[PDB]
Amino acid sequence: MTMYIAFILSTIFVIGFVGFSSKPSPIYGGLGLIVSGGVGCGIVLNFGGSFLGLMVFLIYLGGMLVVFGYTTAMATEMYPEVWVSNKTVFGAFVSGLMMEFCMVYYALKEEEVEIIFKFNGLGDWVIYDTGDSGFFSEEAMGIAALYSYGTWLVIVTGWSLLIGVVVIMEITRGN
Amino acid sequence: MPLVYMNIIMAFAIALAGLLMYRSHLMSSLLCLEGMMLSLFIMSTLIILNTHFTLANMMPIILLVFAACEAALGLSLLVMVSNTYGTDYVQNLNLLQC
Amino acid sequence: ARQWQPDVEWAEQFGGAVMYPTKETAHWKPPPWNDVDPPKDTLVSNLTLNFGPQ
Amino acid sequence: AKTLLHKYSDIPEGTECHRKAYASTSIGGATGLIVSAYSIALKPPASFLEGVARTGRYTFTSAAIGAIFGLTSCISAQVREKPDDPLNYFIGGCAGGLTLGARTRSYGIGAAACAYMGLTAALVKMGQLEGWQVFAEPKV
Amino acid sequence: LLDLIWLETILPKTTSFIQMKMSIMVSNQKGLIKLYFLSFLITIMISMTLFNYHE
Amino acid sequence: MNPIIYTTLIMTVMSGTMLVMISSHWLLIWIGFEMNLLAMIPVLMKNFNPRATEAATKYFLTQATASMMLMMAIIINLLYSGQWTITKMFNPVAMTMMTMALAMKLGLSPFHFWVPEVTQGISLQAGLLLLTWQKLAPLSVLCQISQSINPNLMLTMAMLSILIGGWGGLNQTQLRKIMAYSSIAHMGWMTAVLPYNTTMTILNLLIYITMTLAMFMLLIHSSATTTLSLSHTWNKMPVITSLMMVTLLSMGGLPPLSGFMPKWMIIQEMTKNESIIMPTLMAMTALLNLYFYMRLAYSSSLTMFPSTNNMKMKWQFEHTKQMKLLPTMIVLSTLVLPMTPALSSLN
Amino acid sequence: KFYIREPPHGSPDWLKVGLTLGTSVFLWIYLIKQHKEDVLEYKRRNGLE
Amino acid sequence: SDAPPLTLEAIKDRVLYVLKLYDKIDPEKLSVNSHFMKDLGLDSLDQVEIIMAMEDEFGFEIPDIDAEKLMCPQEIVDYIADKKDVYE
Amino acid sequence: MNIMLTLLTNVTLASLLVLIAFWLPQLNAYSEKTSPYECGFDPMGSARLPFSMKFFLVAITFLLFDLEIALLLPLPWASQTNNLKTMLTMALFLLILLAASLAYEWTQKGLEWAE
Amino acid sequence: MTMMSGRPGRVPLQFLPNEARSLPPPKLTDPRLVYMGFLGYCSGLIDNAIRRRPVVSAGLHRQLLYVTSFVFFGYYLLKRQDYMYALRDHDMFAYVKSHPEDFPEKDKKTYGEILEEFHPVR
C-alpha cells in the first residue's frame, strides 16, 4: 500500500496494452507500446533489475522506430484512426479499461480467484528477500554468466541471428 | 500472487486477445505480437528477480533476441504482401480456402 | 459389347473447385494451372510535391 | 461448466420435475450459446441486429429442446413408477426431437430427431446404469 | 416401396445425405484469418473454463 | 534461391527439431521451435507465386501465436515451481495452455483451419516437409508431458480432428487439401492414444510418415495437384497409378495393409483402459477418409479417364530425376503388417 | 540404334556394379560373423557349452 | 452468391427511376417510348448527362458511339439487355 | 524517487512553456493562415499517402543488429570470470558471426537502396 | 504413459544392451528374416517397375543389395524386439514374486463341486 508506486506502474502498463490492443492507427499503437515499454522498465527497476529494464526499453525504442518507418509506407490509411475516431476502437478501449478496473476492484478490497489463484493486495513490498551482502550486482553477474555457463545458449542465439539475416534476405527477394 | 503479477498476466491476455481479434491492418497485429513478448519479458524478469535465481537472469535477454527474429520475420512478410496489393489489409489474403 | 469407361461429362464432375457445388460455393473458381495468379497491378501512387516558388 | 451437469445429475430421476426441467433448460441454453458463438465467429451476420437474432434463435431452440426433454423424461419416470429405465430417456429424446422439428418447421428433421435423440438419450441412460466411460482415465 | 425406396432411404441414403451436409458445412470457410482466429479465441476461452476450471 | 542457401535452411529446420528433441530445459525447447519456424518460412516461399506468400503469412501467424502461448505456459509453470525441466507440468492452467499451444502447432481441431490453406498454397515438396517433418517436435514434447495431460481435453480435440478431417476431405478436388485433411485425421488418431501409451503414438506417427512420404513422392513423380490432372496418369505411367491405388487403400486402413496396424494397435490399447465407445466412434469415423480415398482411386486407377492429344508427345520421354527411397517407402507403407510385434522395439 | 548415343549402354558402369556387389558381400560376411559370435556368447553366458 | 438474375422489368424500372430523377424532365409526362429530343424538348448535351447517369446506374461504360442512338428509354432498355445478355 | 522528481520537474517546465506560448500572445487564426504549407501553392494530394521506403531491408536488418548489442553489453562484467579462455572464445564468436552477417548482406547487394 | 522408457540402468541410445547377449540369437533361417528378405525383393521389383526396366531381370546387383540390406537390418531389429519382450517377461515375473499378497495362490475346486447354471436350448 506504501506509495502505491508499483501498482500504479502496472496499471499504466495494462492501460498501454489496452491502447495498442484496440488496433487503431499503428502510429498511435506504436506510441502505446512505447509507453508500456517505459513503464515496464520502471517496474523492473523497482525490483532491482536495472540492466534488464534499460535493455528492454532500448530494444523496444529501436523496434518501434522501425515500425513507425514501416507504417508510413505500408499502413498509412489516409484518415488514420485515434481511439475516439471510430466506435469499434473506442468500444475496445473502454472494454479494456472497464475490465481492468473490474479485476482490480474485485482483487483489491476482497480476495477473489480469477483463473489461477487469488490476491489480497498487501503491496508487492511484502515478498522481498532481506538479504544483506555484496560488492556486486546479482543481476549483473547472472547476465554476465552467459559467456561462461551459457556457451550453448550463445551458440544457438548466434546461429539464429545469422540465419535471420539470411532468411529476411531470402523472403524479400521476390522474383 | 500479488497484484503486479495479475496485472502482467492481464496485459498478456489483453495482447493475446488483441492478436486474435483482427481489424484491418496486418501491422496492428504484429504490434500485438510484440506486446505479448514484452509482457512475457516482464513476467519472467519479475519471477527471476524475486526468487534470486542468478543463472536465470540471462534467459529474458535470450527471450528478447528471438523476439526480434520473430518481428523481423513478420515485417518481412508484411513487405511481400504489400508489394502484391499496395495494402497490408488481411482481407486480401483470401486466395486459399478451407 | 464394350466395357463402359468415363467420358467428358463424367470427368467434368471433378473439375470444379469443390466436389459438391453450393449456391455460395459455385462462385469459387479452380486455382490456376500453375499456382500463379494474375499480377495485381496495384497503382502505387507517386507523391506529388511543389518545389518552389518560395 | 461442470456445475450445470451436476445440477441436473444430483436430482433423483423421477422426482421434482420442475427442478430437473430447469437444469436441462440451463444445459440446453449453454449449448445453444456455444453454437451461436462459433456460428457468429465463422459466419459473420452482416449486422449487429442479425447477430443478436441468430443467437437468440439458436439459444431458444436449444433451451426449448432441453426443457422439453427434461420435463417429459422426469414425468415419464414418475408416472410409470420405473426410474432407471432407458425408455424414459428415449421418450424424452423424441420430445426434444419433435421440438427441433417444430422449431425448424420440417417433418423429416423432426422424425430423424425423434429417432436419433431418443436412441442417444437411451444410450446415455444405459451408460449411466452400467458405468460406461466416454473419457477413460488411464489405468494400465 | 420397401426394397427400392425405404430400405435405401433409412440406411445408405440417410448416411450419404448427412455426410454430404456435414462436409459442406465443414469445408465452406472463405479463408479469412479474421474469422477463424476469432474462432481460436472462443476455443481458448472455453478450454480454460470448461476443462481447466474443474481438474 | 541458391542451392547452398536451401541446404542450410533445411539443416536449420532439422536442427531446430532436434534441439526440441534433445533438450531437458524448457527454454531450449522454445528456442528449438523458434529456430524451426524461422528457417521454415523461406522454404514455404521458395517459389514466389503470391499464393505461397499467403500460405507463409498464415503459417507464421499461427505458429507465432502458438509459440507465445507455449512461452506463457512455461512461465506459469516456473512461477508455481522454480522448475525449468520438462516434466509433469506442476500447474494445471499451465498444462491447459501448453496443450492448446501444441494443438495449434500440430493443427488439431479446432486449431485445424490453417493446414488445408497452407498446404494448398505451397509446392508439393514443401507440403511433404510440412506434413511429415513438422509434426515430430510437438509430438515429442507431448510424449514427455503426457502423464500430466488432461484426457478430457486431449480426447475431445482428437475426436474433433478425426471428424473434421473426415468431413473436410469429402468436399475436395485438390490433392493437397485432401492430404491436409488426411493429416488432420491421422493427427487425431495419434493424439487419442497418447495419454494411454506413447509407444502407440510413435508407431502411428512412423506408419503415417511412411505412407505420406510415399503418397507425396508419387504425386511429385506424376506432376499432378488436381484430380483431373491425376486422371491423365493411367495413359502415361500405369504402374504409378497402380502403386498409388494400393497406397490409397492402405491409407484407408483396410487389412492386410500397413495402414491397418496403427488403428488395430490403438483400439486394442484403448480397450485395456476400459475405453470402448471412443475407439468405436473413431473407427466408424475413419470410413469417411476411406471414402474419399476410394473416390480418388476410382478417378486415377480403377477407371480410365479421357486423355489429350499432346500426351502422345510425353510418351517419348522418361522421368529424369529418380527418387531412390520411393520403392522402399511404397513397400513399407503396404506390406509390413506381418512384422507388427517389432513395435516392442519402440519402447 | 539410338539418335543420341545414350551414354549408359551395353558396357555397364563397372565401378558402381563393383561397389554394389562388394557392399552386398561385405554385409553378408559381417552378418554371418556376427551371428557366429552371438551364438558363441549366448552359449558361454548360459553355461551350455 | 453473386448478383441476382436481372430481368427486363428490373432494367425498365431502374431506367425510368433515373429519368424521373432528372430535374429537366417532369416525371408523369415521360413514357417508355417518349423520344428524348422531340417529346421532352431535350438538347444533345442533356442526352449526354442522361447516358452518364445510366453508366452510374448500371456500372458499365457506354461509348460515345452506341450512345448517340439511345434516344428514348426503350432503346436504353434494349441496349442494356444486349450488353448484359438478358432475354426474358 | 529523486529521478521521478527530476522527470516531473522537466515535464512540468516544458508544459508550462507551451502553455505560456499558447496563452500569452494575440491569436488571429483564419483559414488561409492554418492551411498546409507547400511553398505557396496548394498541395496536390494528401500527406497521409504511402511514402515508399527504399532502405526497407536495412531497417529490418537493424532490428537483428540492435539485438546483438544487448548480447554484447554485459561484456565488461564477463571479463571478471575465471574462465577467461571460454569467455573470450564466446565474445569473439558472437562478433565474428555478426561480421559474417554483415558480409553476407553486403555481398548479396542487401545494403543498396531500391530504385 | 511410457511403460519402460525410464527403466533403471537404461543406457539412453544403446539399441542393444549388453544383457541382451544372454539371449539366443535369431536363426538365419528365421521366417521373419525370410519375410524381410521378401520385402527387399519386392522393393527391388518395384524399383525396376518405376524406372521402366525389365522387372524380373533388370539389375541383379541392385536387387541383391535390396535383399541384403533388408535382411541385415531385420536381424538386429529382431534381436532388439526379442530382448525387449524378454525384459517385459523378466520384470513381470519379478514383480509377481515380490508382491505375493497381490497375486494370491488360490486353491481350485473341481467341476464336481462347482455349481454352474444350465440353460436349455429349446
Ligand SMILES: CCCCCCCCCCCCCCCCCC(=O)OC[C@H](COP(=O)([O-])OCC(O)COP(=O)([O-])OC[C@@H](COC(=O)CCCCCCCCCCCCCCCCC)OC(=O)CCCCCCCCCCCCCCCCC)OC(=O)CCCCCCCCCCCCCCCCC
Ligand atoms: C426390413 C425392415 C422393414 C422396415 C423398412 C421400411 C419401413 C421403415 C421406413 C418407413 C417408415 C418411415 C417414415 C417415418 C416418418 C417419415 C416422415 C417424413 O418423411 O417427413 C418428410 C415429409 C416431407 O415433409 P415436407 O415436404 O417438409 O412438408 C410437406 C408435407 O409433405 C405435406 O403436408 P401434409 O398436409 O400432406 O401432411 C402433414 C400432416 C397431415 O397429415 C396428413 O396429411 C395425413 C395423415 C398423416 C399421419 C396419420 C397418422 C395417424 C394414424 C396412424 C396410426 C398408426 C398406424 C396404424 C396402426 C394400427 C395398429 C394396429 O401430417 C401430420 O400432421 C402428422 C403428424 C404426426 C402424426 C403421426 C405420428 C404418430 C406416431 C405413431 C406412434 C406409434 C407408437 C407405438 C404404437 C404401437 C402400436 C402400433 O413429410 C411427409 O410428408 C410425411 C408426414 C407423415 C409422417 C407420419 C407417417 C408415418 C407413420 C409411422 C411412423 C413410424 C416409422 C418410423 C419408426 C421410428 C420413429 C420413432
Ligand SMILES: CCCCCCCCCCCCCCCCCC(=O)OC[C@H](COP(=O)([O-])OCC(O)COP(=O)([O-])OC[C@@H](COC(=O)CCCCCCCCCCCCCCCCC)OC(=O)CCCCCCCCCCCCCCCCC)OC(=O)CCCCCCCCCCCCCCCCC
Ligand atoms: C523412432 C525412430 C525413428 C525416427 C524417425 C525420424 C523421422 C523419420 C523421417 C521423418 C520425415 C522425413 C521427411 C524429410 C523431408 C525432407 C524434405 C526434402 O528434402 O524434399 C524432398 C525431396 C524432393 O526432391 P526434388 O524436389 O526432386 O529435388 C529438387 C530440389 O529440392 C531442388 O532444390 P535445390 O535445387 O536447392 O537442391 C539442393 C539440394 C542438393 O543438395 C546439395 O547440393 C548439397 C549442398 C551442400 C551445402 C552445404 C551447406 C553447409 C552449411 C549449412 C550448415 C547448416 C548448419 C545447421 C545447424 C545449426 C545448428 C545450430 O539439397 C536438397 O534437396 C535438400 C538437402 C537436405 C539437407 C539435409 C540437412 C540435414 C540436417 C540435419 C539436422 C540435424 C543435425 C544435428 C542437430 C543437433 C541439435 C542442434 O526428395 C526427398 O527428400 C524424398 C524424401 C526423403 C525422405 C527420406 C526418408 C526418411 C529417412 C530415411 C533414412 C533414415 C532416417 C532415420 C535415421 C536414423 C538415425 C541414424
Ligand SMILES: CCCCCCCCCCCCCCCCC[C@@H](O)O[C@H](CO[C@H](O)CCCCCCCCCCCCCCC)COP(=O)(O)OCC[N+](C)(C)C
Ligand atoms: C517560466 C515558466 C514558469 C512561469 C511562471 C508563471 C506561470 C504563468 C501562467 C501561464 C499562462 C500565461 C497567460 C498570460 C495571459 C493570461 C491569459 C488568460 O489566462 O487570461 C484570460 C482568462 O480570463 C478568461 O476570460 C476567463 C475569466 C473568468 C472565467 C473563469 C475564471 C474563474 C476564476 C475567478 C476569477 C475572479 C477573481 C479571482 C481572484 C483570485 C484568458 O483571456 P484570452 O483572451 O482567452 O487569452 C489571450 C490572452 N491575451 C488577451 C493576453 C492575449
Ligand SMILES: CCCCCCCCCCCCCCCCC[C@@H](O)O[C@H](CO[C@H](O)CCCCCCCCCCCCCCC)COP(=O)(O)OCC[N+](C)(C)C
Ligand atoms: C513402416 C515401418 C517403419 C519404418 C521405420 C524406418 C526404417 C529405417 C530404420 C531407421 C534407422 C534408425 C534406427 C536404428 C539406429 C540406432 C537406434 C538407436 O540409436 O536408438 C535407440 C532407439 O531405437 C529405436 O527406437 C528402434 C528403431 C526401430 C524402428 C522399427 C519399428 C517399426 C514398428 C513395427 C512395424 C514393422 C516394421 C518392419 C520393417 C520392414 C535408442 O533408444 P531410446 O533412446 O531409449 O528411445 C528413444 C525414444 N523413447 C525414449 C521415447 C522411447
Ligand SMILES: CCCCCCCCCCCC(=O)SCCNC(=O)CCNC(=O)[C@H](O)C(C)(C)COP(=O)(O)O
Ligand atoms: C468548376 C467549374 C469551372 C468551369 C470549367 C471550364 C470549361 C471550359 C470548356 C470549353 C470548351 C468548349 O467550349 S468546346 C466547343 C463547343 N462548340 C461547338 O461544338 C460548336 C457547335 N455547337 C453545337 O454542336 C451545339 O450547339 C452544342 C451546344 C455544342 C451541343 O451539341 P448537340 O446538338 O449535339 O446537343
